Amino acid sequence: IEEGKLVIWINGDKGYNGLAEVGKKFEKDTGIKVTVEHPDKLEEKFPQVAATGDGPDIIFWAHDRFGGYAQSGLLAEITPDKAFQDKLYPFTWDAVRYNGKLIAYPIAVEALSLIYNKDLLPNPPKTWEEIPALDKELKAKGKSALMFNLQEPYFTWPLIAADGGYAFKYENGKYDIKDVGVDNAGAKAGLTFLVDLIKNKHMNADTDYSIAEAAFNKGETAMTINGPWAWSNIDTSKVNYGVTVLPTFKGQPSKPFVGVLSAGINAASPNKELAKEFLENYLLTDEGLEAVNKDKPLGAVALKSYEEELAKDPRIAATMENAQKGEIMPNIPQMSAFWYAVRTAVINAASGRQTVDEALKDAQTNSAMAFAEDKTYKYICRNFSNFCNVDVVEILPYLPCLTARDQDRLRATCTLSGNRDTLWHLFNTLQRRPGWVEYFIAALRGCELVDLADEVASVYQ
Numbered sequence: 073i074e075e076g077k078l079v080i081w082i083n084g085d086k087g088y089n090g091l092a093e094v095g096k097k098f099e100k101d102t103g104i105k106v107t108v109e110h111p112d113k114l115e116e117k118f119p120q121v122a123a124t125g126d127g128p129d130i131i132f133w134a135h136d137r138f139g140g141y142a143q144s145g146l147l148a149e150i151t152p153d154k155a156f157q158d159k160l161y162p163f164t165w166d167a168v169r170y171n172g173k174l175i176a177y178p179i180a181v182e183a184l185s186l187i188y189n190k191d192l193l194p195n196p197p198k199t200w201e202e203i204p205a206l207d208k209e210l211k212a213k214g215k216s217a218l219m220f221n222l223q224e225p226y227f228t229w230p231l232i233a234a235d236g237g238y239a240f241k242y243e244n245g246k247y248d249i250k251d252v253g254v255d256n257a258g259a260k261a262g263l264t265f266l267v268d269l270i271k272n273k274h275m276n277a278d279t280d281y282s283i284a285e286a287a288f289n290k291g292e293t294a295m296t297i298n299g300p301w302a303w304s305n306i307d308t309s310k311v312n313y314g315v316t317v318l319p320t321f322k323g324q325p326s327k328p329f330v331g332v333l334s335a336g337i338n339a340a341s342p343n344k345e346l347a348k349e350f351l352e353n354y355l356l357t358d359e360g361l362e363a364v365n366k367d368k369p370l371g372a373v374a375l376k377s378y379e380e381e382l383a384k385d386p387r388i389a390a391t392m393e394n395a396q397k398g399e400i401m402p403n404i405p406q407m408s409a410f411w412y413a414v415r416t417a418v419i420n421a422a423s424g425r426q427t428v429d430e431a432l433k434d435a436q437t438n439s440a441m442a443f444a445e446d447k448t449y450k451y452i453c454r455n456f457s458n459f460c461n462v463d464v465v466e467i468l469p470y471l472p473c474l475t476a477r478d479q480d481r482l483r484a485t486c487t488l489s490g491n492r493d494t495l496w497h498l499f500n501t502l503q504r505r506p507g508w509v510e511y512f513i514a515a516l517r518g519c520e521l522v523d524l525a526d527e528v529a530s531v532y533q
């Protein structure tokens with residue numbers, strides 16, 4: 073990472089050109105060049121490159137990713153004084169507080185809304201259940217009722233959660249990792265309804281972000297589901313649109329997962345004070361946020377002074393109405409595994425590779441497995457010295473989850489670097505492999521390391 077400049081990563085659906093304008097003004101005042109980038113998969117690349125001390129100085133994503141980054145030591149603790157904290161809504165700071173520390177700056181609150189074409193549909197439906205018949209009628213004039221992105225579970229979550237789906241149960245001050253709601257009756261009813269929409273040819277399983285967007289902005293579909301960032305493309309299309317509350321399902325509100333766009337500082341950045349100055353004194357001002365918002369709308373901003381004006385816009389009131397009905401996402405490290413499991417479930421059920429019941433059963437099983445394995449791997453790392461009696465060569469015969477290639481590599485590592493150094497690689501390789509914990513417990517018992525085996529079983533439970 074280069075000292076004396078700032079490199080920023082933000083998602084390609086956000087106003088990165090407006091952000092670049094804030095960076096130019098920063099450069100004008102400070103002499104520090106700001107490069108804004110929107111890499112593909114930046115939220116997956118970040119933890120890869122940052123672990124090795126590279127990456128951007130500043131990373132923007134919704135807050136659900138940041139607990140995972142913070143647990144890995146990838147983020148600097150942010151240090152706004154009390155006066156600056158006072159500028160932003162307390163509930164937005166709560167989104168970026170992880171184990172008692174502020175780990176990012178909150179930018180804006182995002183919730184999905186129903187966006188509809190007033191010329192095709194002056195009175196949008198209050199319920200999901202009326203969408204099939206509306207589509208049939210619209211199909212008669214060469215249009216459709218509703219298209220939205222079916223490739224990302226974020227857009228389908230509001231419907232899965234409506235009748236009772238949830239990610240993690242919050243109870244007694246904490247999210248319960250072992251109480252997960254993706255395979256209860258409410259979750260199945262929501263996904264079943266979506267699957268039925270597809271089975272009945274009211275939607276297409278491969279509709280994605282760009283397909284849904286093009287159709288809506290060209291007047292071909294009467295409704296879409298999207299967030300505030302999509303509004304400026306609709307503005308330039310001259311579709312006459314409204315933004316309103318999501319349709320209800322089974323008489324209950326759709327419950328979108330609410331994201332706080334947040335900006336974290338790379339723990340490896342040599343430019344932490346400059347990054348703090350940029351974020352506090354340039355971005356989180358009326359002018360900084362205006363510049364970004366004018367490019368792609370941010371949603372309900374964290375900055376009170378600016379939000380007082382945005383709150384007067386019906387599209388923002390609708391956003392916050394949908395937010396009230398949904399839930400702020402957890403920022404916990406288990407969030408990414410939850411989302412991966414739900415993505416697979418929705419795509420498998422929509423495409424017909426699995427029934428809804430198969431798809432959600434696997435989502436529940438596979439996410440619980442992920443949480444438990446990640447926790448065990450984290451425990452092995454923090455307690456490495458407990459495991460330094462483990463002899464890599466002795467343990468390999470009991471680890472059939474390792475491929476022949478894994479075994480040869482580990483042998484070579486052992487030859488070049490010794491057993492202790494190889495143990496780290498052993499654990500790192502195991503955790504990328506299916507069913508590793510059971511076999512690792514077995515392998516420890518096979519080597520007569522019963523207390524160690526029991527200690528692993530205990531953490532994995």
Ligand SMILES: OC[C@H]1O[C@H](O[C@H]2[C@H](O)[C@@H](O)[C@@H](O[C@H]3[C@H](O)[C@@H](O)[C@@H](O[C@H]4[C@H](O)[C@@H](O)[C@@H](O)O[C@@H]4CO)O[C@@H]3CO)O[C@@H]2CO)[C@H](O)[C@@H](O)[C@@H]1O
Nearest residue numbers: 085113115116134136137182224225226331408411412415
């Ligand atoms: O399965 C391979 C795919 O994996 C990658 O996507 C993952 C992410 O890495 C996870 O973080 C998660 O994504 C969440 C996201 O964290 C969450 O904030 C929300 O994202 C919204 C966002 O808040 C909003 O601002 C706007 O940009 O839309 C986003 C959704 O498109 O919801 C996401 C889940 O949909 O899970 C996904 C897996 O779904 C990788 O990037 C993919 O390319 C890859 O196919």
